[PDB]
Each structure stands twice: as C-alpha cells, then as structure tokens.
A = this chain, B = another copy of it.
Amino acid sequence: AVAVDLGNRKLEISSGKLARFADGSAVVQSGDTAVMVTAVSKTKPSPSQFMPLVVDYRQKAAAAGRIPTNYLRREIGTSDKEILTSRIIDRSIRPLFPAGYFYDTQVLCNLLAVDGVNEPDVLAINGASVALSLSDIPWNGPVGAVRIGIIDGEYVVNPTRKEMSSSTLNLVVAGAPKSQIVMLEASAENILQQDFCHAIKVGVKYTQQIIQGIQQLVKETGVTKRTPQKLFTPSPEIVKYTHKLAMERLYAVFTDYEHDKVSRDEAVNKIRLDTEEQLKEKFPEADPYEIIESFNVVAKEVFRSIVLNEYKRCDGRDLTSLRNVSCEVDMFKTLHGSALFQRGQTQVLCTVTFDSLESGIKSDQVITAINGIKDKNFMLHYEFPPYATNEIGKVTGLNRRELGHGALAEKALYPVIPRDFPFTIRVTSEVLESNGSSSMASACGGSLALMDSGVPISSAVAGVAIGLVTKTDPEKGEIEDYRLLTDILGIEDYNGDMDFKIAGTNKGITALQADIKLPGIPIKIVMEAIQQASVAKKEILQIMNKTISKPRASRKENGPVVETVQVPLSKRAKFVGPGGYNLKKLQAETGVTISQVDEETFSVFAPTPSAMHEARDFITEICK
C-alpha cells in the first residue's frame, strides 16, 4: 500500500487482496470512495489487425444505495456518464501501449464504495494505471491523473462534489513520466486563456506526484512483464523497400493541391494496389498484414515529411490557414431554428427544438434506461450517419463516438445557454458530410441555429481542431521539431499526432478535448496549440457573425406556446378520465403535454400553435 498526498487530498493505492486471478488489479481509495480496477490481456494474438482495447466503467449504484430503480430492480444498459468515463480512461492508457500489441485487452472498473464526496471517475484512471503497472501486460510508464477546478480564483486538485458545483473549470489531466501530457479533457465557464493554461501546469505537477507513488509501489512488489508472442510491426527492410517503390508517387499525390477528399484517397489507393502486388512478389513469405502496414507506414512518413520540410499541407494551405467556411440559417419553415455549417468538405446540419420542461426529467425513477437531468434544460444530440462518409453501417443506437462527440459540443455551448429559459432546448446536429472536425462544426452550427431560433445566448461559440506533426529521435524519442496545423483534414488527423479540439467564445474557452496519439507531449506544445486555436477561433467567429450576429428578437411564429386552461371541479373527472386516461390519450394523439398546476388549473404545452388549436377543441367539447 502507498499513500500519495495531493495538497489536502490523500490517495491510497493497494493491491494483492481482491481479484487475485486477474493479470493486474488495484484498489484506489480517496476518503471513503474506493474503486477496484482490473486488467486482463490474452496471450494469443487477436485475429484483428489492430489492438483491441476495451474499457468498461460501471457505476453500480449499490455503492451509493440507489441502483434498483426499474421494474427488474437492476440496471439496464449503460448511462451516458459511464460511457464518457470509459472514454476518458481509454484515452489515458491507450497511447502507452507498445506498437504492434495486437492482443485482446479489457480494463474493468468496479466501484466498491462511493461516499458522495470524492468522485470515483478520477480514481478509476489512476486505478487503471496501477493495475497495468503491476500486471505483466507490456505497458509504458505509470500515468497519473487529477482533476483541477477553480473555486473563487483558487486552483483545487481533485475537488469534491460540493466544490465541483462552484467551479468555473472542470479540467482532467493525465500525465506520463517527465511531465508529458497524454490526455486533456476540460469544460470551462468561458474562462480566460491564461487561467486555463495555468491550471494545466498545476495539474501536470500533481500527476508527477502520483507517478512517483506508483513507481514506489511497483518497485516494492516485483513486477515481471510478459514477453508477447510477437509484436506486429512491419520488418524494417520491407518498409524501406516500400519506400523505394512508392515514395515519388506518394509525394506527387500529396503535393497535388487540386485533390479533394475522395480523389486523394483514390490516388493513394491506386498506388497501394500496385505497390502491394510488388511487395508480395518480393517477400512471398511476409504476413499479408505486414504488407498492408508497411505501405501505411511509408505513406504516413511521406505525408508528414512534406509538412515538416516544406511547411505546406496536402491541400495547399499553410500551417495556420482555415478551410473555406460557409454558413446559412433558416433552412426550413417549420423548424424552430436551423443552420447549415460548412467547413471545407465537412457539412453539418443543426436543428433546435423547444420541448416542454417536463420532458427533461428522464431519469432512473421515470424510466429503466435514461438517467440524470441536465442542469440548464439543454442537451445536444449528435448523429454521424453512414452516408456522411459514403459508407454502409448500422443505424440502430448510437456509437460510443457519437455520444462522446455530442457531449463535447454540448459542453462547448453550455456556458452561453441562458438560465431559466421557459422550454427545454434540444439541439440536434447531423453530420451530412465529414472530412474533419464535425464535432467542432456541431458547436459552430449549434450557436448559429440557437441564435436563429431566438434563444438569447450570451455569445457566439466556435470550435476548431489543431493537429500536430512531430519529428522525434528514433532512439531517444524526444521531440526535435514539430508543426501545429489549424483546422486539420481527416488525413491530417489520421496521419497526425493529436486531434486537439477546443471551442470557445471570442473572449474565452468553453471546452477542450486533446486526443494525443503519441506517448505524451510536452506542455509547451499544448500551450502553443491553445494560442494558435485562439487565432483560428476569431476568424471563424467573424465569418459566422456575417450570417447572424445576434439572436433573433423573438422565437419563430410557429413556435411552442404554454398557457393554462381552467377546468371546473365537477368536470375534473370527465376531463382527466379514469386514472388520467383522457389526458394521456389527448396528449398522445395531439402531441401536447397537459400538467396539473392547481386544483383548477392545467398547464398546456403545445409544440406548434396548430397543435394547441387541436387540443383546445378537444378540451372544449370534453368540458361540454
């Protein structure tokens, strides 16, 4: 057992007591909150051509005393919060796995106890790091993770639930050894850039303390890593022969500025088909996947070398240039608000729907699956249909990626949403075409549609993604040179080192999500990416302001209405019906929502004026 002191917080790490059959296991306790995390990794190579890594974080509300809420008295499905926490843990540990580790791996988090004071999600990230550190699973150095808040202008490490509710910042930092950053995930109440930057360095300092404690625990209990059957990386001489075959053709494709997404992919694919058959002849004994990956390595190396050497991008832009941005509002007459935001070849359609306040309380008690209530009655739903990439896929349910992107754009817009709006605000963002940051375009399109709908948001919100291309030492691994790219394409994210999504107002930052693919990047690079994104965000907000700069003076004429209808006591039974049958039927066939307010009063919400015309007729005849 090891105790780590983080200011006034205490972190207790232990292992060797519970779940001793798993490859790795750890208990991380803070206060009276304890989280057990286990890691399992198969020894037989996975048939998949990548590393299959799954992280599952289960709330298990028996640890809080509030699990059995439905008719089965048992959880059904996984909530939004569980999915989001699973993604944060996944982003914190995925970069540190060695390349070619194609082995099925599962990290599971079990909430032994929660005291309602210390949040278990941060403990779970540290638990995953300890469990992997103590296991025989090949995994690079320990990761420390903290949450940083700002309460009354003071930086607080791992704030309690009470403090998180008074905090203008919710930043989660995962650090690797030598003060590298592997994961950043923030939502802020439109705070200044300098304040945001200081919280990052305070957070990274704390993660080094956790890493020191985990290293002591690893040393105390001897850890011997397994030797995998093999690491699936292409042979060096095969890769360099691929370079001989396809360097010039790939270079020509990547310096052709007339390509669009599809034509560039087809041109690269044309070289791949010719090269691959030549590789098979030269190395008939090579793995078929080894042939495929060697081309991908060469294509990635050529692609990055052009950006590093010539400071020019595959579409002709320089490092700080945006794609073409086109906006337009008032798509359709019946929508409460709408907008179509285009950023390069990325097209996003955003819709705003006003709903009743009563429709925003879908939680554990009301339904088996949904849980929670949004603070401001505001939610964003994000969809990524298969045709946005000319692909075929299942359309039942939502991917974990769709949930994460929706959450990112939701908290990007959340700080500017007004308080005490009469209706529930639902924003739907649909990606019609995608070649880049559709989640950041969902934030820009979201604000346009919100202003078009007449919601008085405090300020317009724009987001952008910053890429990164580095040249590291082949032995030391230190970063010798790097380029930050503004508003990256899909190929620049695929071949890049991070996907640094940040959104905000012209005067502050509201959301950030750094998806780093390297095993950590220095804090200086993160600081510069934030500054570069600040310049890009101003340009985008200037374009958006031309389309619409202030919210419309009122909601659309065909918008929802809320007003009350008086029914007599003698007519209460007739109007309501047996067990509320009449109300539930009128509300089911007209779309309105009737809620009893007093003994005599019923508040009626109608999505359209026509809907209340239908409902008003029914209430009149029923009252007769």
0 or 1 for each of A46-90: is its CB under 8 Å from B? (1 = yes) = 000000001010101111111111111111111110010000000
Evaluate contact between B596 and A578: CB separation under 8 angstroms. Answer: yes
Given A108-B387, A366-B593, the answer on whether A69 and B76 have CB atoms closer than 8 Å is: yes
Contact check, B379 vs A73: say whether CB atoms are below 8 A apart.
Answer: yes
List the number of copies, as a whole number.
3
Q: How far is the CA of A219 from the CA of B353 in the complex (A)?
A: 38
B71 with A77: CB separation less than 8 A? yes
B-contact 0/1 string along A422-459, CB 8 Å cutoff: 00101010101110000000000000000000000000
0/1 interface trace, chain A 330-341, chain B, CB 8 Å (1 if under)? 011111100010
Q: A353-B68, A560-B65 are in contact. Are A363 and B587 (CB under 8 A)?
A: yes
A409 CB to nearest chain B CB (Å): 14
B residues less than 8 Å from A69 (CB atoms): 76, 359, 362, 367, 370-371
Contact indicator B354/A65 (Cβ below 8 Å): yes
Contact segment of A14-22, A186-194, A272-280 = A14-22
Contact A360 B73 (CB under 8 A): yes
Query: Which partner residue on chain B sits nearest A433 by CB separation?
Result: B21
A359 touches B366 (CB 8 A): yes
Instruction: Name the segment of A305-313, A394-402, A509-517, A529-537 touching the other chain.
Output: A394-402
Report whether B369 and A587 are in contact in the complex, using a CB–CB cutoff of 8 Å: yes
Does chain B have a CB within 8 A of A8?
no
Q: A64: which of B105, B391, B607 is its contact (CB, 8 Å)?
A: B607
Instruction: Report yes or no: B61 in contact with A72, Cβ–Cβ below 8 A.
Output: no
Taken together as a complex, chains A and B put the C-alpha atoms of A115 and B578 apart, in Å, by 29
A570 → chain B closest CB, angstroms: 10
Q: In the bound complex, how far is the Cα of B334 from the Cα of A581, in angstroms?
A: 29
Pairwise interchain contact B70-A78, C-beta atoms closer than 8 A: yes
Residues of B contacting A598 in the complex (Cβ-Cβ under 8 angstroms): 572-573
A64–B396 contact, CB under 8 A?
no
Whether A32 contacts B114 in the complex (CB less than 8 A), given A364-B363, A608-B65, comes out as no
> Cβ of A106 < 8 Å from any Cβ of B?
yes
Residues of B within 8 A of A115 (CB): 333-334
Q: Which of A349, A355, A364 has the most CB of B within 10 A?
A: A364
Binds B, one of A34-42, A412-420, A616-624: A34-42
**Contact of B595 with A71 in the complex, beta carbons under 8 Å:** no
In the complex, chain B residues whose CB is within 8 Å of the CB of A385: 38, 108, 110
In the assembled complex, A104 has its CB within 8 A of some CB on chain B: yes
Q: How far is the CA of A144 from the CA of B374 in the complex (A)?
A: 45
* A362, A595, A597 — most chain B CB neighbours (10 Å): A362
Using A370-B69, A388-B19 as known contacts, say yes or no to A396 and B75 having CB atoms under 8 A apart.
yes
**Residue A390 is within 8 A (CB to CB) of chain B in the complex:** yes
Q: Does A209 have its Cβ within 8 Å of any Cβ on chain B?
A: no
A566 within 8 Å of B (CB atoms)? no
Contact status A611-B66, CB under 8 Å: yes
Task: Give min CB distance, A602 to chain B, whole Å.
Answer: 9
Contact A357 B581 (CB under 8 A): yes
Q: Is A591 an interface residue (CB 8 A)?
A: yes
* B369 close to A71 (CB less than 8 A): yes
Q: Which of B71, B261, B371, B381 contacts A426 (CB 8 A)?
A: B71
Q: A526 at the A/B interface (Cβ < 8 Å)?
A: no
> Which residues of B lie under 8 Å from residue A54 when comparing CB positions?
392
Q: For the complex, what is the distance from the CA of A33 to the CA of B332, rounded to whole Å?
A: 9
In the assembled complex, which residues on chain B have CB atoms less than 8 Å from the CB atom of A68?
Answer: 353, 355, 359-360, 379, 381, 424, 426
The 9 nearest A-B residue pairs measured at CB: A66-B591, A579-B595, A71-B363, A113-B332, A75-B369, A65-B607, A70-B77, A74-B397, A64-B355
Other A-B contacts than A67-B398, A113-B335, 20 sampled, CB-CB below 8 A, are A22-B390, A32-B333, A34-B332, A38-B385, A62-B353, A63-B351, A65-B355, A66-B355, A67-B428, A69-B371, A70-B80, A71-B365, A75-B396, A76-B369, A116-B611, A357-B578, A361-B588, A362-B585, A370-B588, A573-B597
Where the two chains meet, the residues of A that have a C-beta atom closer than 8 Å to any C-beta of B are 18-23, 25, 32-34, 38, 40, 42, 54, 56, 58, 60-80, 83, 104-106, 108, 110, 112-116, 261-262, 331-336, 340, 345, 347, 349, 351, 353-355, 357-374, 379, 381, 383, 385-393, 395-398, 403, 424, 426, 428, 430, 432-434, 560, 572-573, 577-579, 581, 584-585, 587-591, 593, 595-599, 603, 607-608, 610-611
